[PDB]
Design a protein around this ligand. Sequence first.
Ligand SMILES: Cc1ccc(Cc2cc(=O)n3c(c2[NH+](C)C)SC[C@H]3C(=O)O)c2ccccc12
Ligand SMILES: Cc1ccc(Cc2cc(=O)n3c(c2[NH+](C)C)SC[C@H]3C(=O)O)c2ccccc12
Ligand code: NA
Ligand code: NA
Ligand code: NA
Lengths: 236, 231
Amino acid sequence: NAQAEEFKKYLETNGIKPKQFHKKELIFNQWDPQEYCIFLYDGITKLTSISENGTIMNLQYYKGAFVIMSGFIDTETSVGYYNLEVISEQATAYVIKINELKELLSKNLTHFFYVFQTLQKQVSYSLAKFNDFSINGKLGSICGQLLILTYVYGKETPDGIKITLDNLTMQELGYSSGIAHSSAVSRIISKLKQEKVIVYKNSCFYVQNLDYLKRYAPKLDEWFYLACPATWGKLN
Amino acid sequence: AMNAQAEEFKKYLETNGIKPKQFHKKELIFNQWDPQEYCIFLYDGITKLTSISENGTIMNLQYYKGAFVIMSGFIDTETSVGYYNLEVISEQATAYVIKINELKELLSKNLTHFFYVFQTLQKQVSYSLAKFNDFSINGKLGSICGQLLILTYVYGKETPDGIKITLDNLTMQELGYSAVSRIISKLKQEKVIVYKNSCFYVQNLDYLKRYAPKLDEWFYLACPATWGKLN
Ligand SMILES: Cc1ccc(Cc2cc(=O)n3c(c2[NH+](C)C)SC[C@H]3C(=O)O)c2ccccc12
Ligand SMILES: Cc1ccc(Cc2cc(=O)n3c(c2[NH+](C)C)SC[C@H]3C(=O)O)c2ccccc12
Ligand code: NA
Ligand code: NA
Ligand code: NA
């Protein structure tokens, strides 16, 4: 990702070193009074929250390279009581105090635009998810999740589009944002497997019916086409 | 009820020769079939983002009220972020309509206003996640409670009849006021709301807060001064 690579170089040019995190660590947390801009360079994370119950809610997934901001750029205060949890075995991120992100974007509108554009992708992502859920329910949500996994990690092979992610992490990601390991979601996913939309073979998973995923997640398909046209184009 | 950053953004646009435009109910400030994309500075009024299927069914995706910024195209590429319309649902709305290419020049010469627009995106992002969180906990009751809570915070007025949502009746029906019916009746039948004299009144604000906790937190975090009027 070229635009992201230039942002990494811009961060290091201003003396910002990367930090390494491990699965289950929090890059930022809902209790910290200080808010941050995270430039997630490599790895996979989820945004989580907690209800009074202590129930962990998975709200959103992010992969490197991407920007996640836990506070508003102007007030520097929280956008919500969120944690950013690493779910890949390792992740690399640049962790900047929000007051400094401001200074840096102030001096290079190209990198301002890069971060601005990431927020725009998030906004339209959530609206597309809402639309697909409003049309097709949890099946739209799950097909959308699988569809984005296929486009981001899939590689065409004779056996179909192989998901090139370790099986451990992949099965976590098959679950859409919401409650942890919902049985209703597990049944949806295994039903797609039973119908051979995604199939296990020789220790790997292959999407063999991409059209089915596109059918039930049409608005996330359009979102990805509009948001990441080159990646979309590779498998269409 | 003055939004200082929005007022300063408005001065900034008008001294760069961008003029306000009026729209009436049902007009599309931008539409899903237009290849040209825009930055909308919605200064006054209420709108809804929609998507229209080939089938012709209209999906209501998001509501916006002035003052706010809605961008139909990505700032860098200038291409669509989604096949969306911005439909006016108040009787009139006022908006500044800026071609996406022209916006890039402006936010670049002023960083305070760049940040104002950036922050509106952040408010939309966190809004959607909070909406999702309340629906995951409380399903449709949470969604409806959240919509009523925001309406109460933004438009509510103290009256002997409760907290009156001060929107003319035509706008309320544009907002939705079968399975929704099943919920709204539970709410009247438990005292939470009442419709009187063709007006809408909240009488158990705590109930709404109970079932839309994450949107309540969003509003506390995003609009503290307004939230504080009823907390
Ligand atoms: C399985 C899965 C689904 C969805 C997301 C979220 C996601 C993916 C993605 O590729 N992009 C974005 C998002 N959201 C942040 C909107 S923003 C633009 C684009 C990008 O990363 O450049 C997943 C993310 C990581 C891993 C799996 C995902
Ligand atoms: C009933 C109803 C619900 C939600 C919204 C959306 C909304 C309201 C709001 O007050 N704010 C925002 C939103 N979203 C755009 C995130 S962003 C921060 C704040 C603001 O306007 O400054 C409604 C909007 C208008 C009318 C009714 C709404
Ligand atoms: Na935090
Ligand atoms: Na192609
Ligand atoms: Na358009």
